[PDB]
Design an enzyme around this catalytic site. Structure first.
Site, PDB file in Angstrom:
ATOM      1  N   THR H   1       0.852  -1.224   0.000  1.00  0.00           N
ATOM      2  CA  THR H   1       0.000   0.000   0.000  1.00  0.00           C
ATOM      3  C   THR H   1       0.871   1.251   0.000  1.00  0.00           C
ATOM      4  O   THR H   1       1.808   1.362   0.790  1.00  0.00           O
ATOM      5  CB  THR H   1      -0.944   0.038   1.221  1.00  0.00           C
ATOM      6  OG1 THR H   1      -1.854  -1.072   1.165  1.00  0.00           O
ATOM      7  CG2 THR H   1      -1.742   1.349   1.265  1.00  0.00           C
ATOM      8  N   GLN H   2       0.561   2.180  -0.903  1.00  0.00           N
ATOM      9  CA  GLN H   2       1.234   3.473  -0.950  1.00  0.00           C
ATOM     10  C   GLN H   2       0.223   4.568  -1.279  1.00  0.00           C
ATOM     11  O   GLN H   2      -0.989   4.351  -1.235  1.00  0.00           O
ATOM     12  CB  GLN H   2       2.362   3.494  -1.999  1.00  0.00           C
ATOM     13  CG  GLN H   2       2.898   2.147  -2.453  1.00  0.00           C
ATOM     14  CD  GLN H   2       2.057   1.532  -3.557  1.00  0.00           C
ATOM     15  OE1 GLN H   2       0.829   1.502  -3.468  1.00  0.00           O
ATOM     16  NE2 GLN H   2       2.717   1.046  -4.610  1.00  0.00           N
TER      17      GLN H   2
END
Ligand SMILES: [Mg+2]
Ligand SMILES: [Mg+2]
Ligand SMILES: [Mg+2]
Lengths: 244, 240, 231, 212, 235, 222, 204, 232, 195
Positions: H1-2
């Site tokens: 996740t970013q």
């Protein structure tokens, strides 16, 4: 590849013998004699150091008798370095047991554990076995005083009196002749030293060529004391028993 | 890890390491198993080359795997301990998961499976051990006696012997054991077991061990004097 | 001699005897023929039975809708290699929505076999394969050796007595390559080719195995009464 | 959901409803909440539908392997414990299961084990699981006897599900009945709750609160 | 020494060829496939009269529709049987159906060449796998340690195999009944066995579509032996 | 925070006849209030006379269908080109779905075909693999609009025979393929009127012993 | 919730003239509930004494761990471990659990057998050594003990005077802490004699 | 996740009678900061495919390298690398779609929306979409981000269904695309005036147009607009 | 689970454990035996999280039974309690700890003494004349503190136990459905079938 150089340390002979175990036992037969004698009021461990020198620092030296815990000791016959590997493992095992159950490890359980480690090297891993035979002298509140031996095969047996190392055939015959069941520690001390004196390959048995230990309930009241004899104390007991 | 194939086939179709493991069994002290009508008796030879032995603490030849099953053996003593430990662990594991103790056949099948595994696994040699496994299945009064060997084959026996001079005592059992009428009592079964060992043992002193297993976890080892009374009675009948 | 104990050892003349011994297993195997035109590619295989009670060992394996092979030698090794081809054909379709080129399939088989000739502990594959297929560049026929050598050919044969069929195809080269849009005639040429490798025995209904792939023809295997037409 | 199982003289009765809901939405009225593990063993579905279906089918595979290896019918004790030990490995991961493993063997007789996704395994005589369990328990407790006939026991299980189906919004559809004997379970049909309710109302005189 | 996975100059794997010699020393097992069922029979060959012969288990159930007989180092068969049973049950779990006899056989044979320096050597046992499925009917397969399996109308393995196979060559036809097959296995077993054939040193079994795999009682087999003796004395 | 799931809308409908089965679905693909495509096929012929649709999150839907099609291919390789029966396919899909029990395919799967007796079959799955054979099943956005109508018009629920007044139910007479297709079309026409995610087109796959046939119908595009 | 104050209890150590003293209460509780009045928190390995406050399971575990380690030490070294060396062993052992620590407040007390020098030391739960000349305190009434010790303590107290000082420090500190008390023990340690005294105190 | 950092806005595209058109502006935004003004977001693969990418620019550059490596890899041991065994738009898309769905399944997505435009070997138009979730779909017109809301309605007036495609010329299609880009410049706060446009035609091949500008803009009417209600 | 009590008298240890098993809304069972015999003269009662309690108890039982067979010897109550404590101390820093509290009542045949050990899920061990887990001690300890004597007979221990249960039944909000009572002494373990 690598197979070419493999000696195959864990195989049977056509006769059903383990080559390396047999050859390790041959090695042990040239080691200094160690004797254990069990009495009603204690156990004696006596052992001969191998052809020493006058410049050897004896009072700080240890090659035969080792402490596993406060209740259990061993006499070594064979490769000293191999023995120390196993001795340290046994010491840890005893402490693991003490931590787990809050009771001192029974003698046989320790002996079985070390013997199982030896056995493993004869069945798997492709490594050479430990060239060591132990005499275990110990006490617990179940069986009291106990003597055991183990050899490179990982087989162990219990004894009233036993020898390992050099001249065991001669030593065992002499012990079998003079041992009695109602014997006491002071008598056993004398028997052990007399047996070594007759079986030794040296010209005479002296204090500097010996290691000596006793496990006695000669500890004030309901407890057990280990006594690793000092050089001067071995010299005194040699005079007392009339060998020097 | 050490992965070398020690157990392999030869041109004539033999696995010599398994066959040499049997030669180790041949060297081992004689063990015998005889099942009566309501019991099984395990007899074991003790070689009298070792005196000054402490018999209290020396490893006994017959070992309880559970309260209702026992195991004796012939061959390498150190090897047998590994099989006994594995069998004891499996016995408890079985009770834990199935909520019922092992049958004698199941325990035999497990031990035999371990032995077989060591004949085609890399970096290991076969067990130099043959075993006699005896007891009674839970809530069952039918006697059970099985035999295993280094190859891992196992089978049920009315009576069987393993170890040195086992050829001789098997000869005795084959002519003396009747299937239509097995030893009806504990006495008769023990007597026949002691008789079979007396064909091979030497002195009937501390050389013979006897363990009797009865239904419902009733296992007891006979003492020197109790066995000595059988030894005495057998030879007094023989003087005729 | 002293240099045939494993695949990791060259001989003094630079030979690899274990690979050569693996090659020998193919020569003991039953004959199988491969040939192609510009529209179709055909496999013909003489199946071998153990005895009169036994079945005839299957020789032809499908790898995809557009590709398959025939085997000669150790059948379990063909199963391993064909499984690998199935996976590679399948990877190409799933990831790239692309049918695996026959030439690329040959390169993959070469590399897989090669790793078994240079490392200790392993052994070479003991089977030869004839791969046929139809892709974006038309019909193809490949010959695989467990040495790793893969060769694209118009026609060939491997197995026992394969030299007879191979010579026939070498004569017929100019004829059978031109058999376009006629599957039956191309198979006939293959059945006539494999007949040059027969001795004592002849092509029966449970003996003969035929496969075909082409322009509008998925890889299909013919056995039993489906090949009686060609006997 | 309402599922029950009780031991009696003639073996075990297993009764379940047939409704599956996603929130207020009734997804199905025809759900099979009895899982036929094998011809001798039954399991009930409550909590997670997939978890129950998957692992009790898997249980049937383990039971089959057991009897192949041991040449003997697996005990209800052993079968239930295979399942409970399995779900216990997954504890914390979010399995949802409340089931009755029901069987009838020689050594045990009729046996029921409540098995549950937090690792619980309970042997018992009467179990009820699901949103409508409290309604079914009332009918069960007040009418249960060991010496019930197979006919009366079957009706009691049917009537107890009906009680739950009426009062609990997430229970209903139809009632599935099973009778477990030593020689295997016997299916006793699907019974639409709509038709059953009116039938029971008239014949029994119950549900006077409801106009019919 | 030499590799376990080594090829001979003739292009054969030494270890596989040597395991075949071990199978030749094994007790005889015979299988006969008919349109009414497949029969499996074995020589028990007890080493001593004190050995309880009913504990000798050389015929084994894999699933309800698949049975198996063994010859050679029978201890090696146990893991093969375990794998077969697991494969059969696993496929039923995944596909809600019976597994094909050939697919079961292929799964067993995939273990065969998984040896090297995986297990340390090939299996020293041959299997006769018999069964029924809806697609190919009654089937008999011979699974070898080479990884090869042949389908057979009839097959004998073990020490009396070549003599038995020659006998099966003459006797088998496509119209055999189940009863005729039973007597034929008994006849050929009796021919190649060292000891005299009876219900205690030989075992029969069969697989039918209706009843599935069944090992025959000693009482049932004893009657078939008596029926065999009379029909041979009939001419 | 990254949300690995999405909702592509869509509605599907499976109905099992006496000797046939239909699996229908709208061809509209959406996110939020936007249309991605007016024609994105959602019901697929998977071979062996089986049709499949995995409605909900389209990425998971496409992945599942792709893996099942792959499973059919390998079933043929591993089991001598044996036909994968609808019951065996259903059990196989359960394992595909349950394999991701703790990171599920966010879809509602329906397959249709014929059983081994030649009778119409429809199977219905939840996201984690619980399944059942059903006669009638709508899935997706407008499932709640369609199912009650099907209970009434296929199973004749709450319908009794005139004159008896609730005493005799309307008998469950078998429906033809033409009759089923009428109910499918009216179901989707009604769903199109009242559900914003339903529209554009209706594609129906009909399965019989002869094979798989397709029918397409226009739906309102607003 | 806070692991260091679930069970309660206190340890205090002091140096005197050719002597050291270490003392502890006897309470073990489950928050408000008193569970045991015989939970001693001082242990000894040869002539080295170790008091441990904090989570009672860790107290027991660490005692068993240091008995384990000091027994192996003795077998290999052929001599009893000294207070300075043991202090480093405690620090090392605690820090090896840096990111999953034992929730304890250990206190070492003893006299070096060769130099005859009195020694005390304290640690935080991850092994930071506090080697004070005067006194070390630990436990749920550590604030109270700091107050008592700071005012009552003076250097070079004789063994029997040191006993009174440390006893009064413990007792009055404990009586201002809900989770401490229920009895107390005081060790008076000299080079080759150790006396152990159980104190009479209020039991609420 | 970013989270996406440097981002590209809409990519827009449509089919016409003989091929496909795709377009995207040359901006790399850093939040509300219009940071980078010379970013090429249309990446050609061979002479038959153009991949248009919106979203995270660092991930775009990674994808650009994957495509470059794909061309290298395809040429290995491939005598027909520039002929029958050249990369197809369909191969390139399926590869990207596989990667996108795998990456989302590891909870580590390539934060992009991608449109693959091209012409197949048989002359068929290829136009398909894939994004960070692995969601894929095809349509006569495709657009990402703001383009989906504003460009699609305009482009769908030209090609409303499949049957409109043969009736749509390249001049009409390009005209519609260019107008859509102007509308996006009026209404998308993260757009720029500069853009690139690519045409892939089955006859004339790949035409790549750089440095295009939005022109013919209406602003004059702004002069009359005063206040927010009552002000004159 | 809910109430588990223990009392060590002159010549025996008495363990009392509630019979109720409650799963949220309903009482599923009212005859549950919350105990396991570890060895002939050692009994362990238990309470805590569902599933873990029985899983832990049977795991301990299996291990002690294994030790008994291997050595042909019964471990002392002290040795068993130390083994159990270590397992729980090991468990508390695991990925998912056993949420189980136990009482271990044993008769030491060597010392001829009854022994009661209280161990919580953290591995907190104490030897006590009487003990409890959860809220049981809050209601019962004031009575035990008053009446308990070390020279009590088994019958007096049972009477004091009845008074404790009566106080629990009066002031506790939960219905725990009475208790199963077991006695551990020199002759082994037996259950009081009327309480
Ligand atoms: Mg709409
Ligand atoms: Mg206080
Ligand atoms: Mg107070």
């Amino acid at each position: 590849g690598s197979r070419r150089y493999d000696s195959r340390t864990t195989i049977f002979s056509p006769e059903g013998r383990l080559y390396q175990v047999e050859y390790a036992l041959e090695s042990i037969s040239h080691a200094g004699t160690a004797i254990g004698i069990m009495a009603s009021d204690g156990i004696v461990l006596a052992a001969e150091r191998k052809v020493t020198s006058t410049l050897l620092e004896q009072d700080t030296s240890t090659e035969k008798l080792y402490k596993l815990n406060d209740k259990i000791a061993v006499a070594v016959a064979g490769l000293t370095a191999d023995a120390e590997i196993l001795i340290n493992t046994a010491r840890i095992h005893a402490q693991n047991y003490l931590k787990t159950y809050n009771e001192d490890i029974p003698v046989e359980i320790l002996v079985r554990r070390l013997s199982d480690i030896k056995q493993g090297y004869t069945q798997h891993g492709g490594l050479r076995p430990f060239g060591v035979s132990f005499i275990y002298a110990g006490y617990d509140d179940r069986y009291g005083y106990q003597l055991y031996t183990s050899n490179p095969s990982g087989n162990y047996t219990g004894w009233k009196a036993i020898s390992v190392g050099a001249n065991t055939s001669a030593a065992q015959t002499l012990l079998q002749m003079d041992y009695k069941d109602d014997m006491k520690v002071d008598d056993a001390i004398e028997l052990a030293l007399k047996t070594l004196s007759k079986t030794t390959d040296s010209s005479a048995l002296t204090y500097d060529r010996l290691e000596f230990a006793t496990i006695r309930k000669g500890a004030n009241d309901g407890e057990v004391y280990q006594k690793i004899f000092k050089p001067q104390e071995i010299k005194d007991i040699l005079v007392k028993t009339g060998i020097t | 890890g050490y992965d070398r194939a020690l157990s392999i086939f030869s041109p004539d179709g033999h696995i010599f390491q398994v066959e040499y493991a049997l030669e180790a069994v041949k060297r081992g002290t004689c063990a015998v198993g005889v099942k009566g009508k309501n019991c099984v008796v395990l007899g074991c030879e003790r070689r009298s080359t070792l005196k000054l032995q402490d018999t209290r603490i020396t490893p006994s030849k017959v070992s309880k795997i559970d309260s209702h099953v026992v195991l004796s053996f012939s061959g390498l003593n150190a090897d047998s301990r590994i099989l006994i430990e594995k069998a004891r662990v499996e016995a408890q594991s079985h009770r834990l998961t199935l909520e019922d103790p092992v049958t004698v056949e199941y325990l035999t099948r497990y031990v035999a499976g371990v032995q077989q595994r060591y004949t085609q696994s890399g970096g290991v040699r076969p067990f130099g051990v043959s075993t006699l496994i005896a007891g009674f299945d839970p809530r069952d009064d039918e006697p059970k006696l099985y035999q295993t060997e280094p190859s891992g084959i196992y089978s049920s026996w009315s009576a069987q012997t393993i170890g040195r001079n086992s050829k001789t005592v098997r000869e005795f059992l084959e002519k003396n054991y009747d299937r239509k009428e097995p030893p009806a009592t504990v006495e008769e079964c023990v007597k026949l077991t002691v008789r079979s060992l007396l064909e091979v043992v030497q002195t009937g002193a501390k050389n013979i061990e006897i363990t009797v297993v009865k239904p419902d976890s009733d296992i007891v080892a006979l003492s020197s004097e109790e066995i000595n009374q059988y030894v005495t009675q057998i030879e007094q009948e023989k003087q005729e | 001699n002293n240099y045939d104990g494993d695949t990791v050892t060259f001989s003094p003349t630079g030979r690899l005897f274990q690979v050569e011994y693996a090659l020998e297993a193919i020569k003991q195997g039953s004959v199988t023929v491969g040939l192609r035109s510009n529209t179709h590619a055909v496999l013909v295989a003489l199946k071998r039975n153990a005895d009169e009670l036994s079945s005839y060992q299957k020789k032809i394996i499908k790898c995809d809708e557009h590709m398959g092979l025939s085997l000669a030698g150790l059948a379990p090794d063909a199963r391993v290699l064909s499984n690998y081809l199935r996976q590679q054909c399948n990877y190409s379709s799933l990831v790239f929505n692309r049918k695996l080129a026959v030439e690329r399939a040959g390169h993959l088989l070469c590399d897989k076999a090669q790793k078994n000739t240079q490392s200790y502990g392993g052994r070479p594959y003991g089977v030869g394969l004839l791969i046929i297929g139809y892709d974006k560049s038309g019909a193809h026929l490949l010959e695989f050796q467990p040495s790793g050598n893969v060769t694209e050919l118009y026609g060939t044969a491997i197995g026992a007595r394969s030299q007879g069929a191979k010579t026939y195809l070498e004569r017929t080269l100019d004829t059978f390559i031109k058999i376009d849009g006629n599957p039956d005639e191309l198979i006939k040429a293959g059945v006539e080719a494999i007949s040059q490798s027969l001795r004592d025995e002849s092509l029966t209904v449970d003996n003969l195995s035929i496969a075909i792939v082409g322009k509008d023809t998925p890889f299909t295997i013919y056995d039993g009464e489906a090949v009686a037409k060609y006997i | 959901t309402t599922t029950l199982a009780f031991r009696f003289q003639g073996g075990i009765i297993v009764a379940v409803d047939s409704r599956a809901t996603a929130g207020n939405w009734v997804a199905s009225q025809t759900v099979k909440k009895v899982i036929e593990i094998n011809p001798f063993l039954l399991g009930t579905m409550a909590g997670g539908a997939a978890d129950c279906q998957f692992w009790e089918t898997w249980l049937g595979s383990q039971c089959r392997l057991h009897e192949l290896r041991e040449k003997e019918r697996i005990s209800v004790a052993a079968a239930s414990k295979i399942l409970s030990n399995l779900v216990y490995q997954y504890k914390g991961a979010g399995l949802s299961m409340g089931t009755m493993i029901c069987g009838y063997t020689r050594k045990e007789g009729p046996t029921i084990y409540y098995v549950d996704s937090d690792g619980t395994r309970l042997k018992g005589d009467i179990f009820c699981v699901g949103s409508g369990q409290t309604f079914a328990y009332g009918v069960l407790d007040s009418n249960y006897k060991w010496d019930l006939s197979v006919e009366d026991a079957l009706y009691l299980g049917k009537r107890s599900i009906l009680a739950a189906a009426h009062r609990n919004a997430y229970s209903g559809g139809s009632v599935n009945l099973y009778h477990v004997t030593e020689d295997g379970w016997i299916y006793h049909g699907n019974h639409d709750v709509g038709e059953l309710f009116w039938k029971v109302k008239e014949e029994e005189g119950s549900f006077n609160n409801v106009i019919g | 020494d030499r590799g376990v996975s080594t090829f001979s100059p003739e292009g054969r794997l030494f270890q596989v060829e040597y395991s075949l010699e071990a199978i030749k020393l094994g007790s005889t097992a015979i299988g006969i496939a008919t349109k009414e069922g497949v029969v499996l029979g074995v020589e028990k060959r007890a080493t001593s009269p004190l050995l309880e012969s009913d504990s000798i288990e050389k015929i084994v159930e894999i699933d309800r529709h698949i049975g198996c007989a063994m010859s050679g180092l029978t201890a090696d068969a146990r893991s093969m049987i375990e794998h077969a049973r697991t494969a059969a049950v696993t496929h039923n779990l995944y596909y809600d159906e019976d597994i094909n006899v050939e697919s079961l056989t292929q799964s067993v044979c995939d273990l065969a060449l998984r040896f090297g320096e995986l297990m340390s050597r090939p299996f020293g046992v041959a299997l006769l796998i018999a069964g029924h499925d809806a697609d190919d009917g009654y089937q008999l397969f011979h699974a070898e340690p080479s990884g090869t399996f042949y389908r057979y109308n009839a097959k004998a393995i073990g020490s009396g195999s070549e003599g038995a196979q020659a006998e099966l060559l003459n006797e088998w036809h496509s119209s055999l009944t189940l009863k005729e097959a039973e007597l034929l296995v008994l006849k050929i077993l009796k021919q190649v066995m060292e000891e005299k054939l009876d219900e205690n040193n030989a075992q029969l079994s069969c697989i039918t579509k209706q009843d599935g795999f069944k090992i025959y009682d000693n009482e049932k087999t004893a009657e078939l032996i008596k029926e065999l003796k009379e029909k041979e004395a009939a001419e | 925070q990254f949300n690995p799931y999405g909702d592509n809308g869509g509605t599907i409908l499976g109905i099992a006849g006496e000797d046939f089965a239909v699996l229908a679905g709208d061809t509209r693909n959406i996110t939020d209030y936007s249309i991605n495509s007016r024609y994105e096929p959602k019901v697929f012929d998977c071979g062996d006379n089986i049709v499949m649709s995995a409605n909900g999150f389209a990425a998971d839907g496409d992945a599942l269908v792709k893996r099942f099609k792959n499973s059919v291919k390998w079933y043929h390789f591993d089991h001598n080109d044996k036909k994968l029966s609808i019951n065996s396919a259903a059990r196989n899909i359960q394992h595909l779905l349950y394999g991701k029990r703790f990171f599920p395919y966010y879809v509602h799967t329906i397959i249709a075909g014929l059983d081994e007796d030649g009778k119409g079959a429809v199977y219905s799955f939840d996201p984690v693999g619980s399944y059942e054979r059903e006669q009638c099943r709508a899935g997706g956005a407008a499932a709640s609009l369609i199912m009650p109508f099907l209970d009434n018009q296929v199973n004749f629920k709450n319908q009794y025979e005139p004159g008896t007044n609730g005493k005799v139910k309307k008998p469950l007479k078998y429906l033809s393929v033409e009759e089923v297709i009428k109910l499918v079309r009216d179901s989707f026409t009604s769903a199109t009127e009242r559900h914003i995610q339903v529209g554009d087109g209706l594609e129906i796959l009909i399965v019989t012993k002869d094979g798989v046939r397709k029918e397409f119908y226009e739906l309102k595009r607003d | 919730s806070d692991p260091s104050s679930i069970n309660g209890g206190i340890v205090v150590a002091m140096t005197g003239k050719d002597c050291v003293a270490i003392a502890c209460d006897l309470r073990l509780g489950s928050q408000s509930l008193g569970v045991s009045n015989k939970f001693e928190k001082i242990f000894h390995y040869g002539h080295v004494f170790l008091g441990i406050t904090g989570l009672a399971t860790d107290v027991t575990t660490l005692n068993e761990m240091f008995r384990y380690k000091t027994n192996l030490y003795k077998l290999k070294e052929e001599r009893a471990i000294e207070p300075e060396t043991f202090t480093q062993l405690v620090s090392s052992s605690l820090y090896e659990r840096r990111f999953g620590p034992y929730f304890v407040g250990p206190v070492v007390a003893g006299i070096n057998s060769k130099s005859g020098k009195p020694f005390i030391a304290g640690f935080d739960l991850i092994g930071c050594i506090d080697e004070a000349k005067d006194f070390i305190v630990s436990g749920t009434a550590s604030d109270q003990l700091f107050g008592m010790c700071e005012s009552l303590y003076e250097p070079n107290l004789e063994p029997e005077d040191l006993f009174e000082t440390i006893s009064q420090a413990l007792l009055n500190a404990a009586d201002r802490d809900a989770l401490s008390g229920w009895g107390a023990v005081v060790y008076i340690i000299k080079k080759d004699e150790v006396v152990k005294r159980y104190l009479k105190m209020r039991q609420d | 996740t970013q989270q996406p950092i440097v981002t590209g806005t809409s990519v827009i595209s449509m089919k016409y009678d003989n091929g496909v058109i795709i377009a995207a502006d040359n901006l790399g935004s850093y939040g509300s900061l219009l940071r980078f003004n010379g970013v090429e977001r249309l990446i050609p693969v061979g002479d038959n495919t153009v991949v248009g990418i919106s979203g995270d620019i660092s991930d775009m550059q990674h994808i650009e390298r994957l495509l470059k490596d794909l061309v290298t890899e395809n040429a290995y041991d491939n005598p027909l690398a520039d002929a029958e065994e050249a990369l197809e738009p369909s191969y390139i898309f399926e590869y990207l779609a596989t990667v996108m769905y795998q990456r989302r399944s590891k909870m580590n997505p390539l934060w992009n929306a991608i449109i693959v435009a091209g012409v197949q070997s048989n002359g068929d138009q290829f136009l398909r979409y894939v994004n960070l979730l692995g969601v894929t779909y095809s349509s006569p017109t495709l657009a990402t981000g703001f383009g989906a809301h504003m460009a699609n309605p305009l482009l769908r007036k030209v090609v409303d269904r499949e049957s409109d495609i043969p009736k749509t010329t390249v001049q009409v299609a390009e005209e519609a695309i260019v107008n859509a880009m102007r509308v996006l410049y009026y209404r998308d706060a993260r757009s720029s005036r500069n853009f690139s446009l690519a045409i892939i035609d089955k006859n004339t091949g790949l035409t790549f147009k750089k440095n295009l500008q939005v022109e013919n803009m209406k602003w004059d009417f702004a002069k009359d607009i005063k206040g927010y209600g009552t002000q004159k | 689970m809910d109430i588990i009590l223990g009392i060590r008298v002159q010549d025996s240890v008495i363990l009392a454990s509630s019979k109720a098993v409650t799963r949220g809304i309903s009482v599923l069972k009212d005859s549950d035996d919350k105990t396991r015999q570890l060895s002939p003269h050692t009994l362990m009662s238990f309470a805590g999280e569902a599933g873990d309690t029985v899983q832990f108890a049977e795991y301990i039982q299996a291990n002690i039974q294994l030790y008994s067979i291997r050595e042909d010897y019964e471990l002392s109550p002290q040795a068993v309690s130390s083994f159990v404590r270590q397992e729980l101390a090991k468990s508390i820093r695991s990925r998912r700890p056993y949420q189980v509290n136990v009482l271990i009542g044993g008769y030491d045949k060597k010392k001829n003494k009854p022994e009661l050990y209280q161990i919580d899920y953290l591995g907190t061990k104490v030897e006590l004349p009487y003990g409890a887990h959860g809220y049981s001690g809050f209601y019962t300890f004031s009575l035990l503190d008053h009446h308990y004597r070390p020279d009590m007979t088994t019958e007096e221990g049972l009477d004091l136990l009845k008074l404790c249960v009566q106080e629990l039944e009066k002031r506790m909000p939960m219905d725990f459905k009475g208790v199963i009572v077991k006695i551990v002494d020199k002759d082994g373990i037996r259950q009081v079938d009327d309480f």
